[PDB]
Design a protein around this nucleic acid. Structure first.
Ligand SMILES: [Mg+2]
Ligand SMILES: [Mg+2]
Ligand SMILES: [Mg+2]
Ligand SMILES: [Mg+2]
Ligand SMILES: [Mg+2]
Ligand SMILES: [Mg+2]
Ligand SMILES: [Mg+2]
Ligand SMILES: [Mg+2]
Ligand SMILES: [Mg+2]
Ligand SMILES: [Mg+2]
Ligand SMILES: [Mg+2]
Ligand SMILES: [Mg+2]
Ligand SMILES: [Mg+2]
Ligand SMILES: [Mg+2]
Ligand SMILES: [Mg+2]
Ligand SMILES: [Mg+2]
Ligand SMILES: [Mg+2]
Ligand SMILES: [Mg+2]
Ligand SMILES: [Mg+2]
Ligand SMILES: [Mg+2]
Ligand SMILES: [Mg+2]
Ligand SMILES: [Mg+2]
Ligand SMILES: [Mg+2]
Ligand SMILES: [Mg+2]
Ligand SMILES: [Mg+2]
Ligand SMILES: [Mg+2]
Ligand SMILES: [Mg+2]
Ligand SMILES: [Mg+2]
Ligand SMILES: [Mg+2]
Ligand SMILES: [Mg+2]
Lengths: 100, 357, 141
RNA sequence: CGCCUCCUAAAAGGUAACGGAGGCGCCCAAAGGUCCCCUCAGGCGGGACGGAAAUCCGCCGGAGAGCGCAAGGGUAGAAGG
RNA sequence: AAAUGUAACA
RNA sequence: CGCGGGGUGGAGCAGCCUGGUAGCUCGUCGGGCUCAUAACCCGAAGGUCGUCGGUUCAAAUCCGGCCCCCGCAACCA
């Protein structure tokens, strides 16, 4: 993942969903990596296997819809307060019998 | 049209020099610059910190007013330096000037309203009839209308919480939520008994009568009296009951006594047989008794207000609505508008702005 | 805090804590992880205390992944009743944790930060833990 | 407090506790017999009143519908219409 | 068979 | 903790048990009578049926869980 995402500069986190990608390729032809330019990602943008520039002779073996990288908001103490005073509704029990 | 707006920046700035007293604060500023000037003044720095923080407390007055008489005067010479040379950039560059000092003077006008703890909470207006009766209940309804049209012409929300209409004609009392921005600052200088001298319509032969009604104004608090019970301050004793039970009661420590340490409140329970039924119950009773003290505090502060809250009576007042010679006088600052049925429309800005000194 | 939003059954037998984890034994998201060394019921209280400890160490930044979740209702009878008269009331919920499970997992954070945060989080838990970082063994899973 | 379904019950059967959950004390003259014929729910598109859902058209569809009522088992190569 | 009208009459 | 009864406009109650339809009184609002107010007369408005879920084609109503309210019981040592 080449580049520093601009979301990272804004305080975000680069979540590396895939650190490798599945591929059909010749053994004589195995690349060492595949670069991906993530510097354009904000919070919260995402890259997909379709966005992969592939080198010659290598051929994507997952769905291009597969998400590979995303930039997510950070962990923040200013939120703790609301989460502590957040009240939870007690769990509902799924009805059985003449109650469905 | 632009030198009319310098004409006004010199108007709000002069009686701004009146309550601030440039004459009485250019004085005090100098022997604090003198005390703090000799090298022994960081000897008990408590003495020092109050004065160096005072010094800009007075240099946000003295020297800020010192950039208003020089600043405006270098504005009015640069805008004549743009008319007679046809230089329109000397007049955009002496207007970017009038937008900067229109804020240092706006900032110095928040010594009127930025001094009152919470002068921003959505306040409540508590209007009451008074001396006279029917006439004053009429005047009471007139005076709610007056503050309602006021609050609309000022961006507030006209939110009526509680009424009670009078039985002959009018209102005995009303409470409005003035839901708006900085609302308490404006309407706290409206607290008082409004006398209405007037000419009366309910008296048969048409006699001239006086009738009073009040306006009391307060802000909004947390209004939450649900203090949590924390085990750091409860001491719970356990011992035997005092009546029937048998080899039980004798031979079992079923009775509990919970005593809140800082308050001194004690409480027992012996009703049941388990000390945990009793520890349960005494926790309830102990909750409720500190819910009753924290109640007694709040009511105590309320009665302190009530007994310090005028009387809506003769010689207890702040205004004339002598509508038989068309005046409305605020005996407190005190101004004299002659356009009476324009005050009832909501021109209260007049009195308010001059009453915040 | 964490609990199922709804369920087919309110109460659940206690079961048992035999063996190593069924799954979730490898780092799957973040850069480092906190792995359980001994079995326990981890309450939702303990999970939340660990989480808050970690965000409160990161202060701002990073990303925490909680990979266990308390769906098992914990039950207890009212104080000083006798045995019998039905099963106790649901008082809280727990996540069943067995040796080898990656409970928490952090990313977007330096190595000393991750080490320290996961340590402090480990002190909030009723079991011995171990700090791990992502490996090729993890990647190969 | 008797009866039915599921779990606890440790892969035959059976198996307890004031263990965890629900039902029954009816009903149907067709909701029964036998011949013959037919196939669902749902999703997507189209379509006067007309809607999330009335009926209609088309395409996608092994059963997730239905089987009077709890649950389980079974079931369109019918037990369903 | 049916209530009431305060508070500043030269 | 137990048993069983309730929560429905601004207020107090009816409606449930044998499900589809929420009513009465006071109040509130507009109009009249009066010099004016009350009283009276004419017309009008007004309810997430405590919440979550859901029985059924369909719930204020039927059946569970929680939440406040009321009554009773809590004994033998
Ligand atoms: Mg005694
Ligand atoms: Mg003893
Ligand atoms: Mg004893
Ligand atoms: Mg007029
Ligand atoms: Mg057990
Ligand atoms: Mg298991
Ligand atoms: Mg435990
Ligand atoms: Mg337990
Ligand atoms: Mg006992
Ligand atoms: Mg038991
Ligand atoms: Mg229990
Ligand atoms: Mg617990
Ligand atoms: Mg586990
Ligand atoms: Mg530990
Ligand atoms: Mg796997
Ligand atoms: Mg068995
Ligand atoms: Mg079995
Ligand atoms: Mg068996
Ligand atoms: Mg066996
Ligand atoms: Mg046999
Ligand atoms: Mg039964
Ligand atoms: Mg037939
Ligand atoms: Mg036939
Ligand atoms: Mg269809
Ligand atoms: Mg359609
Ligand atoms: Mg249509
Ligand atoms: Mg249609
Ligand atoms: Mg079926
Ligand atoms: Mg049934
Ligand atoms: Mg006896």
């Amino acid at each position: 993942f080449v580049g520093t995402p601009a979301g990272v500069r804004a305080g975000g986190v680069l979540q590396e969903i895939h650190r490798d990608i599945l591929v059909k390729v010749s053994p004589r032809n195995i690349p060492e990596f595949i670069e991906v330019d993530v510097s354009g990602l904000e919070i919260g943008d995402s890259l997909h296997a379709s966005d992969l520039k592939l080198p010659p002779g290598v051929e994507l073996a997952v769905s291009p819809e597969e998400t590979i990288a995303a930039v997510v908001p950070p962990e923040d103490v200013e939120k703790l307060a609301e989460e502590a005073a957040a009240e939870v509704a007690e769990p509902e029990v799924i009805k059985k019998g003449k109650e469905e | 049209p632009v030198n009319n707006r310098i004409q006004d920046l010199t108007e709000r700035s002069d009686v701004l020099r009146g309550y601030l007293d440039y004459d009485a604060k250019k004085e005090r500023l100098e022997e604090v610059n003198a005390e703090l000037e000799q090298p022994d003044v960081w000897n008990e720095p408590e003495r020092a910190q109050a004065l160096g923080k005072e010094r800009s407390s007075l240099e946000a007055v003295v020297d800020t007013l010192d950039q208003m008489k020089q600043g405006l005067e270098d504005v009015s010479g640069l805008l004549e330096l743009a008319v007679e040379a046809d230089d329109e950039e000397t007049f955009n560059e002496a207007v970017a000037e009038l937008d900067a000092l229109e804020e240092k003077l706006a900032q110095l006008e928040f010594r009127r309203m930025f001094s009152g703890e919470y002068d921003s909470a959505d306040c409540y207006l508590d209007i009451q009839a008074g001396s006279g009766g029917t006439e004053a209940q009429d005047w009471a309804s007139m005076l709610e209308r007056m503050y309602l049209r006021w609050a609309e012409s000022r961006g507030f929300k006209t939110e009526i919480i509680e009424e009670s209409e009078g039985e002959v004609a009018g209102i005995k009392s009303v409470t409005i939520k003035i839901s708006g921005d900085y609302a308490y600052g404006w309407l706290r200088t409206e607290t008082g008994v409004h006398r209405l001298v007037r000419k009366s319509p309910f008296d048969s032969g048409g006699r001239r009568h006086t009738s009073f009604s009040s306006a009391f104004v307060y802000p909004e608090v947390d209004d939450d009296i649900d203090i949590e019970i924390n085990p750091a301050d409860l001491r719970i004793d356990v011992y035997r009951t005092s009546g029937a039970g048998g080899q039980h009661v004798n031979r079992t420590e079923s009775a509990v006594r919970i005593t809140h340490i800082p308050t001194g409140i004690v409480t027992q329970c012996q009703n049941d047989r388990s000390q945990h039924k009793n520890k349960d119950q005494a926790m309830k009773q102990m909750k409720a008794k500190l819910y009753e003290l924290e109640m007694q505090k709040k009511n105590a502060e309320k009665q302190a207000m009530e007994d310090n809250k005028s009387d809506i009576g003769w010689g207890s007042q702040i205004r004339s609505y002598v509508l038989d010679d068309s005046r409305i006088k605020d005996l407190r600052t005190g101004v004299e508008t002659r356009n009476t049925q324009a005050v009832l429309d909501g021109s209260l800005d007049q009195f308010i702005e001059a009453s915040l000194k | 805090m964490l609990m199922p939003r709804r369920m087919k059954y309110r109460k659940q037998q206690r079961g048992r804590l035999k063996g190593a984890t069924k799954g979730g034994d490898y780092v799957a998201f973040g850069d480092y992880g906190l792995v359980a060394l001994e079995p326990a019921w981890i309450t939702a209280q303990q999970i939340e205390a660990a989480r808050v400890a970690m965000v409160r160490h990161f202060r701002r930044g990073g990303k925490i992944f909680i990979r266990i979740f308390p769906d098992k209702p914990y039950t207890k009878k009212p104080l000083e009743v006798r045995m019998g008269k039905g099963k106790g009331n649901v008082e809280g919920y727990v996540a069943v944790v067995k040796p080898g499970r990656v409970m928490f997992e952090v990313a977007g954070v330096t190595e000393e930060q991750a080490m320290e945060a996961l340590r402090i989080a480990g002190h909030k838990l009723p079991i011995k833990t171990k700090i791990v970082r992502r490996d090729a063994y993890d990647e190969a899973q």
